[PDB]
Every structure is written in structure tokens, then in C-alpha cells.
Amino acid sequence: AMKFTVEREHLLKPLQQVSGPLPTLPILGNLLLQVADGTLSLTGTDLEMEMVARVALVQPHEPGATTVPARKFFDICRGLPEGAEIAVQLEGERMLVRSGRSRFSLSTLPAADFPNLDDWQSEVEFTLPQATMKRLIEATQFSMAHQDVRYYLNGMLFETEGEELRTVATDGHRLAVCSMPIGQSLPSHSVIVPRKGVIELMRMLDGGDNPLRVQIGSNNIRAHVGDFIFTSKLVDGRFPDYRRVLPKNPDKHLEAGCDLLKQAFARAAILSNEKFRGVRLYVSENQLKITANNPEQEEAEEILDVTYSGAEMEIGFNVSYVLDVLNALKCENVRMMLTDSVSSVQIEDAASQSAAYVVMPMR
């Protein structure tokens, strides 16, 4: 049956990564272990997504497969000393793990009962640096709907158009869009990655120099990074079009220091209604006044110097939506584009149009 000896440090990161998608059935709490032609494959799944890690075997080994409790096996490997040689074999319906004078006997479930993800064909493929995928996700993730009845908004849109890859996240009130050049001509394609897929995809980016290879099918997405393969089912719905909510011909433009603006909204927020989070913005020549009041008649007022030349205007916003945008931007200055008090506002870094944020106001 299955046999392998591997150095602790060659198993650690693979074990950590495959335990990511991790139950309704006990087999989902296990990792599938497979030894075949000089490689140990490790697979973790939740039925909607799977993570596969491949580990080269330089020490003697024997082919086969089994399933073992994921958390228990990882914890044993992690718990062993640095540089430990981990010897693994099967003895009946048990997996034996031996290192130094430490012995473990783990329960197994047959490899044949491990859920296989359905075979599929990729329709679009591209390679991009890890940092580019990280920036796309981080710039938009906070805007995704939190358990909405419009299931399609619970995920993140991944859209290829021309030589660009874009991410879009919205909850029907606020929206985030990030576009990044990928240097490869792509067919126009849009897919919705579920919330858990986005988290796993983000968790798989070690922050190194290995490129990410993306394959997108009709109902599945696959990301290859070094010796890791992440696969996720796609959300079967139709996402709305970010273009439709972008302010058409904004007649008002405001520029301000991001930190001063964030700190003023943060202080105003303290005295905003706890459920509604409403704050009022008063825009006038080179000035922004922010006000908040709550049901107990408490009031906050913040006056800031901004760059603004347009007509005077009052506009109401959910302060948590504004603060989410200001925390997502990591720039010195922000630009706010407006029309009127009943129309969306666009917020972005004053020196980059790569990320746009659209917030609907409150009456």
C-alpha cells in the first residue's frame, strides 16, 4: 500500500494550503493523499472547491492512496521538530505516522470515497503576477454582498476584456471596480467567483515571484501557483454592469487628503445613528463640513480644507460605506466626483483610475 518519507518542511505549507477549503459528511474533513510516480498529491475539498498540492518525493516510496483527518495530520506535522523526517505507511484501516520516537495511528476513509470534482474544459486562460491578483481582490473584496438573497452579488465578478482583467464587487448600494493590464489579448468573458473562492484564491498567494496561471471554464475556475492548484465552481447567475452606475458627466469634483478625510469621517461616525450610520456632507468653496447626529440628540461636526470649486451642495451618506472606500485606498489624496444629492458619487485615488468606487447616497 501507500508509503512515503518526507522532510517536515516539504510538507508543512502544502498541508496548510489544502486544509483551506475545509463538514456535512466525515470524508470532507479528510485530505486525500496519493502517491504516484515520484509525487505525493494532497487534496482538500468542500464539494464546491478543492485545493491540490504536489510534493516531489526524493526518498523511497510506494504507490497508493488514502484519506486522513486533515487538521489532525497537519497538527502532527506542525508539532514535530524542525528538520524531522516524517515516515508514513498504512496498516489496515489506519495511517501510521512515525518521526523520531513519536508514533501516531490515524483513522482512514477509503480514497475511492473521496469526492472528485467534475471534469471540465477551460475556455479562457491567462498568466498574471500574484501581486496583480492580490491587488484586484483587495481593491474590491469589501464591496461584496454579505449573504444577499440576490446570490449572484455574494461573489466577485472576474471579467476579461481586451488585454485587461477586472474585478467587480457590489451590494446594490456601493460598488468597487478594479482593472489591471495583463498583456495578453483575451476573449470577452465574465464569471462570478463565490465568496469562499475569493478568500481561498487570496489565501493561496504566498507573496512570492511565482506567476499565477488562470483557467476559466463555463462553470469552474482554476488557479495554478507553483505546486498548488485551486479549483472552484462559479456562481450560476448574471452580474449587473458597473458601467451603468458610473456617474455619466460629473459636474462636481472634490479633492482631499485621504488621512484627514478618513479621520474626520471616523470621528463623525461615533455620533452617527448606530444602525443607519448617516452622515451629512456640506460641500462649499475649498471646504467640506461633515455632520452626524444620533437619536439621543448628540452631534459631531468636522470642518476640512479640500479642493472644491463647484456649486454648494448637501449630500447624505452611510459613513461605513465611505470609510470602507477610504480604508481600501492607500494613497495620499482622494478625488470625489458628484452630480447631485440623489445620485451616485465616484471616489478614487486622485493619481490612479485603476480602482473606482461608487457609493449611492442616503435621503
Binding site: T170, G172, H173, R174, L175, P240, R244, V245, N318, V342, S344, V358, M360, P361, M362, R363
Partner: peptide
Amino acid sequence: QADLF
């Protein structure tokens, strides 16, 4: 709170 669409 106003709706985007």
C-alpha cells in the same frame, strides 16, 4: 439608503 440600479 438609495439603490445603484
